Amino acid sequence: TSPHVNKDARDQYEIRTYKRLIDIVQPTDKTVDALMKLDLAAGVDVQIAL
């Protein structure tokens, strides 16, 4: 934290990454097109695998 010399003066920061997994089984035809119609919210990244 200090600009020149204080070794014991530190700030401790952290960052967390959260993950979720979702499975879709027996997908109807409307399911897929609904999934691309679904909006994307900032701050959440989505990966879809077929």
Binding site: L40, A41, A42, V44, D45
Partner: protein
Amino acid sequence: GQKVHPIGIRLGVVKRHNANWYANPKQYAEYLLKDLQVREFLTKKLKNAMVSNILIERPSGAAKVTISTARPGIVIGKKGEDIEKLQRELTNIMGVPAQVSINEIDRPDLDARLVAEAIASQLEKRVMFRRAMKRAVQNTMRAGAKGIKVEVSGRLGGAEIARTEWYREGRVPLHTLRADIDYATMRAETTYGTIGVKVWIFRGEILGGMKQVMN
């Protein structure tokens, strides 16, 4: 002693982040550097438009910049030319298409940044600092805050020895994590050097926690 940053200590408690996007560890640094460049450029360009907050989002391969301003007409322009020019420059800087959005502040006297900017402008225009401080504090208290503290530091009045003077009316519970406290810092550049201005404004205690705040 030294005090923790009022917004930093509450960034995860009752406050929202100014940047809302996700990036993998490889792209995090590039995204952050471009965001900082965007913030600096906007701050330089909109100096006289009363802009306090800038929120940057990256929803999907694009960018959205929300500007909180008290001069929406000046920011927008006569016929919308300014906003489209701003979109062009932001897209050029950021490498992706960018959308500018405007959020109008209806109570400028309850915004910490605007008060500090006004006080610094007066100090540069060499009004006496105690009059400036008392006027700003009274104006905010009339506007309806539950407390405001104003501090100025430096070569006040041109004296050879610097000093610090502060003024407070109302309640400022700095140690309450759930209190809503806006904080701002600014510089006045006078012929005799730099004068620092700090402003705290208290607007009541938020209840329900971050669940209520809806992160």
